[PDB]
RNA sequence: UAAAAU
RNA sequence: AGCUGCUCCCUAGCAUGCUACUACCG
RNA sequence: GCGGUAGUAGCAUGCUAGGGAGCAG
């Protein structure tokens, strides 16, 4: 169950990086630290907190058309 | 503007060490051999902490070519070697050949003389110049997820909660302040001054460990360069790789260059690069790319000995020995030599490349160069030593976009790194033994041969002043009998007599702690060191592999197995097309299953399931590759012997000795 | 000597087939990364099943996004957009804001006028007047 | 420059260490500052002194390389900038 | 080298090479296209020829697959296979192929000549894929036909830019307009290098033609001007994206209290935003165009982009935008071509302006929130695909009237095109119904709206703005001085010569004629700045001067008469050959010596 | 090779200054009409009278005069300095000049529009 | 034979 | 973007080696 | 009937050269 969230955080940081988010050093530092801290977690309840904090970065900007990719 | 403090060194010597009767040459250019070089550089290491740190480095000077003035380094001032002046420096030239263009574009003189001044408050390392108008912040990306393999592994019971094998090797990402924040770890290199009357004995024993090889210079038509598509350093990487500079120079330009660096000093510039690889800890890893003008020369100086080290079997340094076809078993069977109450032990050097002093690096260079007793003259060997010191031990690192100076310690990406590390490892082990035997109460040593050996060891260190070869051979035989070693570049395994070590007649692990504390400026915790009392289970770890005594056919055999998490992590995380869509990549999994075969013989059970998982995945990959190539065109291939890759007999033959 | 000239043609055929295939795939794979990565991401997210993430994802569908990283401290700020009233009802009951499966105490509402709105002014009737996409600010419980 | 000839002609031999040439002859300095507390003690104001000379500030940027005016570099506004700032100054006589 | 079939969208690698646009076809579809058409060339990963040196057989239906190559039956190897066999052709992905039975319409499009009305009539009743296929192949056919025109060289030098040329005898000479350009090459012995592009203009007398050079290369006697052709880029996005409805307003936030002058448009402004795309059809000179900027400020924060196919249209609506919006407004029209130039406002290079105005062929690839394409009666499916390809936005709005003017479509020479088939969105507006309706005149005199609504529309127009000054003296027109196929008649100009100064206050009228060259005759002996009836259509002025020609099928077109009379404020005149249009005409009759 | 023009291509003219050089200006626009041509200035006639005259005719463009022998370059600075403002640019020698050469400025920058030198 | 393209 | 060491896989060329069968002589 | 060279086809080894991939310090 924690391996699930670790691989998901890998995919999330890769998407964020593809969206040119490392053009702003503050944001990229925040996301990088959240990612490396998720990968080193050792109890699945902190990982989900930092995952919601990390996904908020993608939900912020409007570059990914969310209503389309949510066709379920 | 003062860069030659030669009288102040002599005045300091006469003030503090006045009755020390040996001649002290402030500039080691006037030394008599290599032991004199060590003796005088030991004092220079101390006295150089008084003078200003802006007076060390290249010594530029204005020359004229075709009526145009250049600024180029004639020779460098060193903290350990003093002042050194080039011998062929010619003012007023008409035109530059290829070789001279190479040696004037590799110097840091005109790059640093013509750039903006720099004050970098991020580091404590002395920063020289900024070669351009804006600093560069390099990042590191996260790995790619191979979802098919992960799903497949999950569908067969892997990664369930509370299991033995779980994922701990990932691709960690890093932000902008990662190159410089890691370069700043050179603040761990202090100016250590070694005990010289003991180093001058340890160096003789260490050299005796290297007596069954042969070395010397070779001509430019005998060097071997594997992979000529590697970067060429700075500034040469603006114009091509190493292939371009190995094709543009004839076999006479390279020989002119080599024979030139025996009389002159060429300082170079090292780049620092951020690695992109799997790991278990989030500390960024970086490597030093050295200039082509330095590798091209160190190759002809050192390669004959380096190659004769990697082709010997049964020695102490086990570089070049392979672990397949019964190599692991042979290495362990030869370390266990004959030792009489054997325990095994192994240790760890904390920050081995940043914290290594400079005296031991110079000692490693001298021990490697002791093989040129015929090819080179004496001033030649000194100028080659000065070149190695000016190019890999204090050098102008080019980090980010700006030049800094490097205080000391090994640069990881130079020509002779993995062998200098081995010399330094043996040096520390021999020092530990000397300290452990001299520091014991000679009144209670009952074995009246070891007591007399102690007496003569003291007398040979601190009284007799010329080398005594019979006792050197005697102590070396004692060491090879009671303390057997197996060394790779800083990775050692020692099989030692335990009865002696208990009575303090050979090193223990505390002795390494003390030696590292006072000779290496680090604290080695008892937690990264391991020991082992039961020899039917070999080294707890050596080269990141554990050892297992299995039954292979009729007899018993040592086999190396890895860490299951490592193999799975390499299966699941990659670089975009690699593995992701492995149907184009079936050799990746063949190799990873070659590495994960011994896990089959393991008493645990998930361990073996790793290997079986890899075999079934290869089968599935092939089954769904033929299915696609059949509908793409309409006819299956006519022959593909790829059915051998999912039966165990192809892999077992890689750990059985014939081949 | 005529069976050994189709044994070689039959081999050039294979080493052209097995090369053109991977040259086609190995190039289609690299021409679709920005759109396969996202579908993979959301597949894995939906499979994860965590209400803390489903909440913000659903919310985010109906134009209720946040304006900064969701903080974790028991006291930093969160500024989220609210585009319509039927959104405002389901989340802001009085002065508590229910986002990311938590409870945040609402302190300052401010419409697109960039000027403050009183919380008691927001209701069904008087809604048609406010420049609507608002920005609610709050602090975690 | 005639400054380079000026320092070379004072050498009692003709050769001088390299590490001092950009120190005494360069015409542009670039400071890289990690945090505000360090900016306070080093380049504070619009003219400061380093390497025994008097440098004058012009053009300040940040990690993203976008301009910054010295009015934004206050202490309460410090947590809103890309923190390694790169102050480029010239040599003023 | 792989794609998708044009009919069933399956994987394939075959292209019917004999077709001009080289479309991908699957196995079955390529077999069907080649078994019933003169097209029998195919190209897969490599062309399908007989690979024997000296053989040139190319008919696929008789070729044979040999060893690592395809061979003629005469040059067959001892071991081989036939390519076309069992109702299919051999390509990649053979056994996973889906065969659509649209081969009838596909062959129709592939072998047609675009000369009769049936070709366009079937071009706009097929699936979307075939729609785009027919569009690009039709444009290709037209612009390659343009190559069959004649060539011109020098004859003698007369000045620095008015000279005498020689058209090659026996082949059609191209029309003389500033958008038909020829590149000039000198061929001395030796020396055949480009000297520049040229656009010409027949000046005051023959055979002289004033010209405009791209660079001051001093013209000599040995050069020539050959027309330079153009290429066609294939399309991707469909003509119109599929519709979606909503239950609440999405992406757009309205207002309550700005400029209720757009009063009756509010409920419609909402219905625009609660859909995915909608259309507004409007009789000439009503709330259209007005509606555009009205919705624009109703949604102030909304990014909006405006577009039309005709330059004068986008310019006139940019003017009407300037009349009402913050500036804060740019018209990214054209950097430096379309030599009949345009606006004077801002920028062509920024694309952050909230209001961008341009013409379809020069659109940048931007994001938006609303795209207001204008006058869909003049655009073709090609252009609609161009806009849907370059831009993406949230909503789309199309405004026009199919009863006005269509696209010229030069090559069609028999039959008539009903507006239903002008393009896709005109079809949509007339098949089910403009999903948005607004119809009563604001602009031109009440009486002339009565005239026009009496004829093209069944009568359904009302307005204000009454008299005065309207006249149609049925004026004999003399010599049809026809140099180019565009008519010229200056005895007809003898009426502005009959009314040069006797109009002492009618000084800023606008002159428009159906023919471009007789309008350059208005630019020959000058009365006022003149325009064409095509550079009108979305443009309005106070008083209008108009001249016709003989009763050719050209000028007799009721739609051009509509768009010529309906563009005034309160005065017009019609000088018509007139057999029954002055029996259509609802004004006061005049004569030539009738000046009072 | 030769290529003429229907206009003086970008020749930013003087209005009416130096019409005493009119016997030259009548043909100075010829410079803008063709690519190039030649001129025969017999001894004592219009040598570098034509050249400096056209220099005056176009005071908003960099123009060059060149020679082969340095007696010619001195006679080239001759007949020049008066009709030139100074505002002078005639740089010939960096480290040559077996006899003395130019007299006023530099060799490292090339300032004002009219510059003199030798071909070699 | 009507518009008109880095 | 480093210096080494080991291992698997694919392709090419050459000579050597090996073997079969065909042509010339001894 | 056999010795010698010259051939083709087939086979194994070894060595050079080229490319791809995996692990270790
Ligand atoms: Zn000495
Ligand atoms: Zn040597
Ligand atoms: Zn066809
Ligand atoms: Zn098909
Ligand atoms: Zn044939």
What chain D holds in terms of domains, given with CATH numbers, is: 3-91 (3.30.70.3540)
Of all helices (H) and strands (E), which one includes residue E307? strand E304-308
Residue B543's nearest CA partner among B516, B530, B562, B524 is: B562
Alpha helices in B196-355 (DSSP H): 196-208, 242-247, 253-260, 292-309, 327-335
Question: DSSP letters along B519-568, please?
Answer: HHS----TTT-EEES-TTS--S-BTTBEEEEEEETTEEEEEEE--HHHHH
Measured CA to C1', the nucleotide nearest B578 is I21
Whether the Cβ atoms of residue E152 and residue E402 lie closer than 8 Å to each other: no
Residue E593 dihedral angles phi and psi, to the nearest 5°: -80, 15
Of all helices (H) and strands (E), which one includes residue E104? helix E103-111
C-alpha angle E461-E463-E468 in degrees, rounded to nearest 5: 115
Residue A51's nearest CA partner among E38, C50, E324 is: C50
Residue D39 dihedral angles phi and psi, to the nearest 5°: -55, -35
Which architecture characterizes domain E446-589 according to CATH?
Answer: 3-Layer(aba) Sandwich (3.40)
Dist CA E375 CA E401 (whole Å): 7
CA of B413 to C1' of H4 (A): 9
C-alpha angle B78-B83-B86 in degrees, rounded to nearest 5: 110
Q: Which CA distances in Å does C40 have to A11, A70, B570, C33?
A: 8, 12, 20, 10
Q: Which residues contact E248 (CB under 8 A, 6 or more apart)?
A: C84, C86, E274
Residue E484's nearest CA partner among E150, E145, E142, E147 is: E150
Dist CA B368 CA B420 (whole Å): 8
Task: Indicate the SS3 state at residue E283.
Answer: coil
Q: Active site includes B576? A: no
Of C17, C29, C30, the CB nearest to B637: C17
Q: Active site includes B491? A: yes
Measured CA to C1', the nucleotide nearest B592 is I22
Measured CA to C1', the nucleotide nearest E232 is G5
Please report which ligand is nearest the Cα atom of E75. 5
Whether the Cβ atoms of residue D32 and residue D84 lie closer than 8 Å to each other: yes
Residue B230's nearest CA partner among B443, B415, B497, B99 is: B415
What is the Cα B94 distance to its own chain's centre? 43
Q: Which residue has the tokens 């030792």?
A: B339
Q: Residue F38 burial by CB count (10 A; 0-12/13-18/19+): exposed, middle or buried? A: exposed
What is the Cα F113 distance to its own chain's centre? 9
Peptide bond into E328 cis (omega under 30): yes
Q: Which residue has the tokens 């190659």?
A: B307
Q: Per DSSP, what are the bridge partners of residue B439?
A: none
CB atoms within 10 A of CB B84: 23
Q: Which residues contact E1 (CB under 8 A, 6 or more apart)?
A: E13, E45
Spell out a b/e string for B47-83, using b for 16 or more CB atoms within 10 Å of the CB, else e.
Answer: bbeebeebbbbbbbbbbebeeeebbbbbbbbbbbbbb
CA of B142 to C1' of H1 (A): 18
Please report which ligand is nearest the Cα atom of E3. 4
Q: Per DSSP, what are the bridge partners of residue B193?
A: none
CA end-to-end span of chain D, whole Å? 16
Please report which ligand is nearest the Cα atom of E106. 3
Beta-strand runs (E) in chain F: 63-67, 89-90, 114-118
Residues of E with CB under 8 A from a CB of B: 92-96
As a whole number of angstroms, the longest Cα–Cα distance in chain B is 93
Dist CA C124 CA C86 (whole Å): 9
Q: Enumerate the residues of chain C whose CB falls inside 8 A of the CB of residue E68.
A: 9, 12-13
Whether the Cβ atoms of residue E6 and residue E33 lie closer than 8 Å to each other: no
Q: Which residues contact E314 (CB under 8 A, 6 or more apart)?
A: E306, E307, E308, E331, E333, E342, E357, E358, E359, E374
Q: Residue D84 burial by CB count (10 A; 0-12/13-18/19+): exposed, middle or buried? A: buried
The count of residues in chain D is: 93
Please report which ligand is nearest the Cα atom of E64. 5
Q: Is the CB of E563 under 7 A from strand G?
A: no
Task: Indicate the SS3 state at residue A19.
Answer: coil
Dist CA E253 CA E479 (whole Å): 62
Whether the Cβ atoms of residue B51 and residue B77 lie closer than 8 Å to each other: no
User: Could you tell me the residue range of the domain that residue C87 belongs to?
Assistant: 51-140
Binding residues of B for Zn(2+): 25, 31, 36, 40, 217, 372, 375-376
Q: Which residue has the tokens 């004037």?
A: B104
Dist CA B217 CA B298 (whole Å): 10
Beta-strand runs (E) in E325-419: 355-359, 370-374, 395-400
CB atoms within 10 A of CB B373: 10
Given CB atoms, is F4 within the 8 Å cutoff of chain E? Answer: yes
Residue B194 dihedral angles phi and psi, to the nearest 5°: -90, 160
β-pairing, E530-532 vs E510-513, is parallel
Residue numbers 242-301 of B with CB closer than 7 A to any atom of strand I: 278
CA end-to-end span of chain A, whole Å? 22
Whether the Cβ atoms of residue B321 and residue B327 lie closer than 8 Å to each other: yes
Spell out a b/e string for E126-155, using b for 16 or more CB atoms within 10 Å of the CB, else e.
Answer: beebbbbbbbbbbbebeeeeeeebeebbbe
**Token code pair at residue E500:** 């040069």
Residue E409's nearest CA partner among E152, E135, E87, E210 is: E135
Dist CA E295 CA E302 (whole Å): 10
Whether the Cβ atoms of residue B66 and residue B95 lie closer than 8 Å to each other: yes
CB atoms within 10 A of CB E335: 9
**Token code pair at residue B21:** 């009767």
Given CB atoms, is C41 within the 8 Å cutoff of chain B? Answer: no
Dist CA E218 CA E213 (whole Å): 10
Whether the Cβ atoms of residue E378 and residue E309 lie closer than 8 Å to each other: yes
Measured CA to C1', the nucleotide nearest E174 is G1
Given CB atoms, is A64 within the 8 Å cutoff of chain C? Answer: yes
Whether the Cβ atoms of residue D20 and residue B1 lie closer than 8 Å to each other: yes
Distance from the C99 Cα atom to the nearest Cα atom in chain B, whole angstroms: 29
Q: Which residue has the tokens 């015409």?
A: D27
Dist CA B549 CA B547 (whole Å): 7
Dist CA F56 CA F83 (whole Å): 8
β-pairing, E277-281 vs E395-400, is parallel
Ligand 1 mean position to B301 CA, how many Å? 24
Whether the Cβ atoms of residue F32 and residue F9 lie closer than 8 Å to each other: yes
Residue B503 dihedral angles phi and psi, to the nearest 5°: -85, 10
DSSP letter (8 states) at residue E234? P
Dist CA E358 CA E339 (whole Å): 15
β-pairing, B396-399 vs B491-497, is unpaired
Q: Which CA distances in Å does E447 have to E105, E354, E469, E470, E566?
A: 48, 40, 11, 10, 11
Q: Which residue has the tokens 């050996």?
A: B453
DSSP letter (8 states) at residue E588? B
What is the Cα F109 distance to its own chain's centre? 18
The D residues from 9 to 68 touching A (CB cutoff 8 Å) are 62-64
**Token code pair at residue A28:** 């990229």
Dist CA E456 CA E563 (whole Å): 11
Residue B36's nearest CA partner among B47, B44, B24, B48 is: B24
CA of E78 to C1' of H23 (A): 29
Check if E265-432 and E446-589 are the same fold: yes
Task: Indicate the SS3 state at residue D86.
Answer: strand
Of all helices (H) and strands (E), which one includes residue E530? strand E530-532
Residue B224's nearest CA partner among B308, B128, B314 is: B308
Q: Residue B468 burial by CB count (10 A; 0-12/13-18/19+): exposed, middle or buried? A: middle
Distance from the F33 Cα atom to the nearest Cα atom in chain E, whole angstroms: 9
DSSP letter (8 states) at residue B276? -
Alpha helices in A1-72 (DSSP H): 2-18, 25-39, 46-60, 66-69
Q: Which residues contact C62 (CB under 8 A, 6 or more apart)?
A: C83, C87
Q: Which residue has the tokens 């205080």?
A: B407
Q: Do E160 and F7 make contact, defined as CB atoms within 8 angstroms?
A: yes
Residue numbers 191-230 of E with CB closer than 7 A to any atom of strand G: 230
Q: Which residues contact E264 (CB under 8 A, 6 or more apart)?
A: none
**Token code pair at residue B131:** 């070669």
Q: Closest residue to H3 by CA to C1' distance?
A: B413
Whether the Cβ atoms of residue E183 and residue E228 lie closer than 8 Å to each other: yes
Q: Which residue has the tokens 């974790």?
A: C72
Q: CA torsion sign, E266 to E269 to E271 to E273?
A: negative
Ligand 1 mean position to B9 CA, how many Å? 13
CA end-to-end span of chain F, whole Å? 23
Given CB atoms, is A36 within the 8 Å cutoff of chain C? Answer: no
Q: Active site includes B489? A: yes
Task: Indicate the SS3 state at residue B38.
Answer: helix
Strand E304-308's sheet: what is its strand order? E277-281, E395-400, E370-374, E304-308, E355-359
Q: Which residues contact B172 (CB under 8 A, 6 or more apart)?
A: A36, A39, B140, B142, B279, B281, B282, B284
The count of residues in chain E is: 596
Q: What is the CATH classification number for the domain harbouring C91?
A: 3.30.70.3540
Dist CA E489 CA E89 (whole Å): 61
Residue E455's nearest CA partner among E573, E562, E582 is: E562
Spell out a b/e string for E561-576, using b for 16 or more CB atoms within 10 Å of the CB, else e.
Answer: bbbbbbbbebbbbbbb
Residue C108 dihedral angles phi and psi, to the nearest 5°: -160, 125
Residues of C with CB under 8 A from a CB of A: 33-34, 37-42, 44-48, 50, 52-53, 56-57, 60-61, 65-72, 100
Residue E436 dihedral angles phi and psi, to the nearest 5°: 180, 125
β-pairing, D53-61 vs D85-91, is antiparallel
Round the CA-based radius of gyration of chain C to a whole number and report it: 28
Alpha carbons within 13 A on the beta-carbon side of F39: 15
Dist CA E152 CA E176 (whole Å): 12
Whether the Cβ atoms of residue B174 and residue B571 lie closer than 8 Å to each other: no
CB atoms within 10 A of CB A64: 17
If phi > 0 it is left, if psi is from -120 to 50 it is alpha, else beta; for residue E191 that is left
Residue B63 dihedral angles phi and psi, to the nearest 5°: -115, 170
Round the CA-based radius of gyration of chain B to a whole number and report it: 28
Of all helices (H) and strands (E), which one includes residue E81? strand E81-82
C-alpha angle B581-B587-B590 in degrees, rounded to nearest 5: 115
Dist CA B220 CA B586 (whole Å): 40
Spell out a b/e string for C10-32, using b for 16 or more CB atoms within 10 Å of the CB, else e.
Answer: eeebeeeeeebbeeebeeeeeee
Axis-axis angle for helices B417-438, B358-369 (nearest 10): 110
Whether the Cβ atoms of residue E378 and residue E423 lie closer than 8 Å to each other: no
**Token code pair at residue B215:** 């070395």
β-pairing, B116-120 vs B483-488, is unpaired
Q: Do D82 and A26 make contact, defined as CB atoms within 8 angstroms?
A: yes
**Token code pair at residue E437:** 């309706």
CA of B615 to C1' of H11 (A): 27
Residue B329's nearest CA partner among B6, B66, B655 is: B655
Q: Domain E265-432 carries which CATH code?
A: 3.40.50.300
Residue C135 dihedral angles phi and psi, to the nearest 5°: -130, 100
C-alpha angle E402-E405-E411 in degrees, rounded to nearest 5: 115
C-alpha angle B446-B452-B455 in degrees, rounded to nearest 5: 120
Q: Which residue has the tokens 């059949």?
A: B630
Q: Which residues contact B147 (CB under 8 A, 6 or more apart)?
A: A7, B580, C40, C44
Dist CA E595 CA E502 (whole Å): 8
Dist CA B24 CA B36 (whole Å): 9
**Token code pair at residue B342:** 């054997």
As a whole number of angstroms, the longest Cα–Cα distance in chain D is 54
* Strand G positions within 7 A of protein Cβ atoms: 1-6
Experimental method, per PDB record: cryo-EM
C-alpha angle C82-C85-C88 in degrees, rounded to nearest 5: 55
Q: Is the CB of C22 under 7 A from strand I?
A: no
Q: Which residue has the tokens 């016709």?
A: E548
Whether the Cβ atoms of residue E204 and residue E163 lie closer than 8 Å to each other: no
C-alpha angle B28-B29-B33 in degrees, rounded to nearest 5: 70
What is the Cα E138 distance to its own chain's centre? 13
Whether the Cβ atoms of residue B196 and residue B303 lie closer than 8 Å to each other: no
Dist CA B194 CA B360 (whole Å): 9
Q: Per DSSP, what are the bridge partners of residue B287?
A: B273
Interface test with E, best of F1, F5, F6 (most E CBs within 10 A): F6
CA of C26 to C1' of I7 (A): 46
Task: Indicate the SS3 state at residue E193.
Answer: strand
Residue B403's nearest CA partner among B619, B628, B180 is: B180
Q: Enumerate the residues of chain B whose CB falls inside 8 A of the CB of residue A16.
A: none
Q: Which residues contact F108 (CB under 8 A, 6 or more apart)?
A: none
Q: What is the dihedral of CA E398, E401, E405, E407, to 10 degrees?
A: 30
Q: What Å resolution does this PDB entry report?
A: 2.9
If phi > 0 it is left, if psi is from -120 to 50 it is alpha, else beta; for residue F44 that is left
Residue F20 dihedral angles phi and psi, to the nearest 5°: -65, -30
Catalytic residue among B55, B308, B489, B508: B489
Q: Residue D67 burial by CB count (10 A; 0-12/13-18/19+): exposed, middle or buried? A: exposed
Q: Closest residue to H4 by CA to C1' distance?
A: B418
Catalytic residue among B490, B563, B595, B609: B490
């Amino acid at each position: 169950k924690m391996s699930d969230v670790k691989c998901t955080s890998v995919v999330l940081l890769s998407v964020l990086q593809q969206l040119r988010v490392e053009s702003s050093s503050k944001l990229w530092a925040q996301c990088v630290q959240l990612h490396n801290d998720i990968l080193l977690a050792k109890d699945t309840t902190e990982a989900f907190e930092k995952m919601v904090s990390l996904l908020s970065v993608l939900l912020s900007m409007q570059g990914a058309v969310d209503i389309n990719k949510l066709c379920e | 503007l003062k860069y030659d403090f030669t009288e102040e060194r002599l005045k300091l010597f006469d003030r503090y060490f006045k009755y020390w009767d040996q001649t002290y040459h402030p500039n080691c250019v006037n030394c008599l051999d290599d032991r004199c070089i060590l003796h005088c550089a030991n004092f220079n290491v101390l006295f150089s902490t008084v003078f200003p740190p802006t007076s060390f480095g290249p010594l530029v000077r204005k020359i004229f070519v075709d009526g145009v003035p250049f600024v180029v380094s004639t020779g460098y001032h060193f903290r350990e070697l003093g002042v050194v002046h080039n011998q062929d420096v010619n003012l007023h030239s008409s035109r530059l050949s290829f070789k001279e263009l190479l040696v004037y574009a590799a110097d840091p003189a005109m790059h640093a003389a013509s750039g903006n001044l720099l004050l970098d408050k991020r580091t404590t390392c002395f920063s020289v110049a900024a070669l351009t108008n804006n600093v560069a912040f390099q990042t590191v990306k996260p790995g790619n997820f191979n979802k098919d393999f992960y799903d497949f592994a999950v569908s067969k019971g892997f990664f369930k909660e509370g299991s033995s094998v779980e994922l701990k090797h990932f691709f960690f990402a890093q932000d902008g302040n990662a190159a410089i924040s890691d370069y700043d770890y050179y603040r761990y290199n202090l100016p250590t001054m070694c005990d010289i009357r003991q180093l001058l004995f340890v160096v003789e024993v260490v050299d005796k460990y290297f007596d069954c090889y042969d070395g010397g210079c070779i001509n430019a038509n005998q060097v071997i360069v594997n992979n000529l598509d590697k970067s060429a350093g700075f500034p040469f990487n603006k114009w091509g790789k190493a292939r371009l500079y190995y094709d543009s120079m004839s076999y006479e330009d390279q020989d002119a260059l080599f024979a030139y660096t025996k009389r002159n000093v060429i300082p170079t510039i090292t780049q620092m690069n951020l690695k992109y690889a799997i790991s278990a800890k989030n500390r960024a890893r970086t490597v030093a790319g050295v200039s082509i003008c330095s590798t091209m020369t160190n190759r002809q100086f050192h390669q004959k000995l380096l190659k004769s080290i990697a082709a010997t079997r049964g020695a102490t340094v086990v570089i070049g020995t392979s672990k397949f076809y019964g190599g692991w078993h042979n290495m362990l069977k030869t370390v266990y030599s004959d030792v009489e109450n054997p325990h095994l032990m192994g240790w760890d050097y904390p920050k081995c490349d940043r914290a290594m002093p400079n005296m031991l690096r110079i000692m490693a260079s001298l021990v490697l160069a002791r093989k040129h007793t015929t090819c080179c003259s004496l001033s030649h060997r000194f100028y080659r030593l000065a070149n190695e010191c000016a190019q890999v031990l204090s050098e102008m690192v080019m980090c980010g976009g700006s030049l800094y100076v490097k205080p000391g310690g090994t640069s990881s990406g130079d020509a002779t790194t993995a062998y200098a590390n081995s010399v330094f490892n043996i040096c520390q082990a021999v020092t530990a033994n000397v300290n452990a035997l001299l520091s014991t109460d000679g009144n209670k040593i009952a074995d009246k041969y070891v007591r007399n050996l102690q007496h003569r060891l003291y007398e040979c260190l601190y009284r007799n002043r010329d080398v005594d070869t019979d006792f050197v051979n005697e102590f070396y035989a004692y060491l090879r009998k009671h303390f057997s070693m197996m060394i790779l570049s800083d990775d050692a395994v020692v099989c030692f007599n335990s009865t002696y070590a208990s009575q303090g007649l050979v090193a223990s692990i505390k002795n390494f702690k003390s030696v590292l504390y006072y000779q290496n400026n680090v604290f080695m915790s008892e937690a990264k060191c391991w020991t082992e009392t039961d020899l039917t289970k070999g080294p707890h770890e050596f080269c990141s592999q554990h050892t297992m005594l299995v039954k292979q056919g009729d007899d018993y055999v040592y086999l190396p197995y890895p860490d299951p998490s490592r193999i799975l992590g390499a299966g699941c995380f990659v670089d975009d097309i690699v593995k992701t869509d492995g149907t184009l990549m079936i050799e990746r999994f063949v190799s990873l299953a070659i590495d994960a075969y011994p896990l089959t013989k393991h008493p645990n059970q998930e361990y073996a399931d790793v290997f079986h998982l890899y075999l079934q995945y290869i089968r599935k990959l092939h089954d769904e590759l033929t299915g696609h190539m059949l509908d793409m065109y309409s006819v299956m291939l006519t022959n593909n012997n790829t059915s051998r890759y999912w039966e165990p007999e192809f892999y077992e033959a890689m750990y059985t000795p014939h081949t | 000597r005529d069976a050994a000239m189709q044994r070689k043609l039959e081999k050039m055929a294979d080493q052209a087939m097995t090369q053109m295939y991977k040259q086609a795939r190995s190039e289609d794979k690299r021409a679709k990364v920005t759109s396969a990565m996202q579908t993979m991401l959301f597949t894995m997210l939906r499979k994860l099943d965590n209400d803390a993430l489903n909440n913000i994802i659903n919310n985010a569908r109906d134009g209720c996004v946040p304006l900064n990283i969701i903080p974790l401290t028991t006291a930093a700020k969160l500024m989220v957009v609210i585009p319509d009233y039927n959104t405002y009802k389901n989340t802001c009951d009085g002065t508590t804001f229910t986002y990311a499966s938590a409870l945040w105490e609402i302190q300052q509402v401010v419409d697109a006028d960039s000027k403050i709105v009183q919380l008691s002014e927001i209701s069904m009737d008087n809604s048609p007047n406010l420049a609507w996409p608002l920005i609610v600010t709050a602090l975690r419980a | 420059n005639d400054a380079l000839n000026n320092i070379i002609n004072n050498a009692r031999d003709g050769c001088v260490p390299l590490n001092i040439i950009p120190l005494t002859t360069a015409a542009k300095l670039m400071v890289v500052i990690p945090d505000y507390n360090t900016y306070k003690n080093t380049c504070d104001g619009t003219t400061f002194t380093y390497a025994s000379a008097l440098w004058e500030i012009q053009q300040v940027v940040d990690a993203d390389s976008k301009i910054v005016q010295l009015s934004e570099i206050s202490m309460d506004n410090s947590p809103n900038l890309a923190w390694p700032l790169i102050v480029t100054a010239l040599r003023a006589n | 080298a792989v794609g998708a079939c044009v009919l069933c969208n399956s994987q394939t690698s075959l292209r019917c090479g004999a077709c001009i646009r080289r479309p991908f076809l699957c196995c079955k579809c390529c077999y069907d296209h080649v078994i019933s058409t003169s097209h029998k060339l195919v190209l897969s990963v490599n062309p399908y020829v007989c690979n024997a040196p000296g053989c040139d057989v190319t008919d696929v239906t008789q070729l044979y697959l040999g060893g690592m190559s395809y061979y003629c039956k005469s040059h067959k190897p001892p071991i081989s296979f036939p390519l076309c066999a069992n109702g299919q052709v051999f390509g990649l992905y053979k056994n996973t192929c889906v065969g659509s039975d649209n081969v009838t319409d596909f062959n129709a499009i592939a072998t047609c000549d675009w000369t009769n009305a049936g070709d366009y009539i079937l071009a706009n009743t097929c699936t979307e894929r075939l729609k785009l296929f027919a569009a690009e192949t039709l444009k290709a056919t037209e612009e390659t036909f343009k190559l069959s025109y004649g060539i011109a060289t020098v004859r003698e030098v007369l000045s620095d830019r008015e000279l005498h040329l020689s058209w090659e005898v026996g082949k059609p000479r191209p029309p003389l307009n500033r958008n038909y350009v020829f590149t000039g090459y000198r061929v001395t012995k030796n020396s055949k290098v480009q000297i520049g592009e040229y656009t010409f203009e027949k000046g005051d007398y023959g055979d002289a033609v004033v010209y405009r050079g791209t660079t001051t290369y001093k013209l000599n006697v040995g050069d020539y001007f050959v027309l330079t052709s153009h290429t066609v880029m294939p399309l991707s996005a469909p003509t119109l994206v599929p519709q979606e409805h909503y239950v609440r307003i999405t992406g757009l936030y309205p207002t309550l209290n700005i400029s209720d002058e757009f009063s009756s448009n509010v409920a419609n402004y909402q219905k625009v935003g609660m859909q995915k795309y909608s259309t507004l059809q409007g009789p000439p000179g009503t709330g259209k165009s007005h509606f555009a900027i009205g919705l624009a400020l109703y949604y102030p924060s909304a990014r909006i982009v405006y577009t039309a196919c005709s330059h004068a249209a986008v310019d006139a609506l940019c003017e009407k935008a300037l009349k009402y919006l913050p500036i804060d407004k740019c018209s990214r029209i054209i950097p430096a071509r379309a030599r009949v130039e345009c606006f004077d406002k801002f920028k062509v290079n920024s694309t952050l302006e909230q209001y961008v105005f341009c013409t379809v062929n020069a659109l940048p690839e931007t994001t938006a929130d609303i795209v207001v394409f204008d006058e869909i009666s003049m655009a073709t499916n090609y252009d609609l695909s161009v806009v849907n390809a370059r831009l993406r936005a949230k909503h789309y709005v199309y405004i026009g009237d199919p009863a006005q003017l269509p696209a010229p479509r030069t090559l069609l020479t028999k039959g008539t095109l009903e507006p239903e088939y002008f393009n896709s969105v005109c079809r949509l507006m007339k098949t089910i119904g403009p999903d948005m309706f607004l119809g009563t005149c604001r602009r031109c005199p009440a009486e002339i709206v009565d005239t026009v609504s009496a004829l093209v529309y069944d009568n359904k127009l009302k307005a204000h703005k009454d008299k005065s000054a309207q006249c149609f003296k049925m004026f004999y027109k003399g010599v049809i001085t026809h140099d180019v196929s565009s008519a010229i008649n200056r005895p007809q100009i003898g009426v502005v010569r009959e009314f040069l100064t006797r109009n002492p206050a009618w000084r800023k009228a606008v002159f428009i004629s159906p023919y471009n060259s007789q309008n350059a005759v208005a630019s020959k002996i000058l009365g006022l700045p003149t325009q064409t009836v095509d550079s009108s259509q979305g443009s309005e002025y106070d008083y209008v001067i108009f001249t016709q020609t003989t009763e050719t099928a050209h000028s007799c077109n009721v739609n051009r008469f509509n768009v010529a009379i309906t563009r005034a404020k309160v005065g017009i005149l019609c000088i018509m050959s007139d057999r029954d249009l002055y029996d259509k005409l609802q004004f006061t009759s005049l004569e030539i010596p009738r000046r009072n």
